[PDB]
Amino acid sequence: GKLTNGALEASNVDLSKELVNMIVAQRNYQSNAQTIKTQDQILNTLVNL
Amino acid sequence: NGAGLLYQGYVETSNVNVAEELVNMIQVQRAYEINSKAVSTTDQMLQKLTQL
């Protein structure tokens, strides 16, 4: 396509989408940590008999 | 010909599950402890028979 002199392209990012993705990623990371903790406890109860 | 596939950058871990290993350890310990009792009882019977 045609070019345009005297102009520069933007960063093509959206702050709101990035913020909501950050929140969802944090929640998912904590949810996985909950599974890790559950596995830790379920093995600790078995090893201790 | 039934050969498997290859994945780059992965590694194949062991197929050992500690959860069943611990209970199997309990089972084998109990079985060993029981089997020792037969030896002890046979020894006691022989000792009693000797003292006639």
Curated annotation (Swiss-Prot), chain A:
It is found in: Bacterial flagellum basal body. It comes from the Bacteria. Disulfide bonds: none annotated. Transmembrane segments: none annotated. Belongs to the flagella basal body rod proteins family. This is Flagellar hook protein FlgE. It comes from Salmonella typhimurium (strain LT2 / SGSC1412 / ATCC 700720). The gene is flgE. The chain holds residues 354 to 402 of 403 of the full protein.
From Swiss-Prot, chain B:
This is Flagellar basal-body rod protein FlgG. It is found in: Bacterial flagellum basal body. The basal body constitutes a major portion of the flagellar organelle and consists of four rings (L,P,S, and M) mounted on a central rod. The rod consists of about 26 subunits of FlgG in the distal portion, and FlgB, FlgC and FlgF are thought to build up the proximal portion of the rod with about 6 subunits each. The lineage of its organism: Bacteria, Pseudomonadati, Pseudomonadota, Gammaproteobacteria, Enterobacterales. Disulfide bonds: none annotated. Belongs to the flagella basal body rod proteins family.
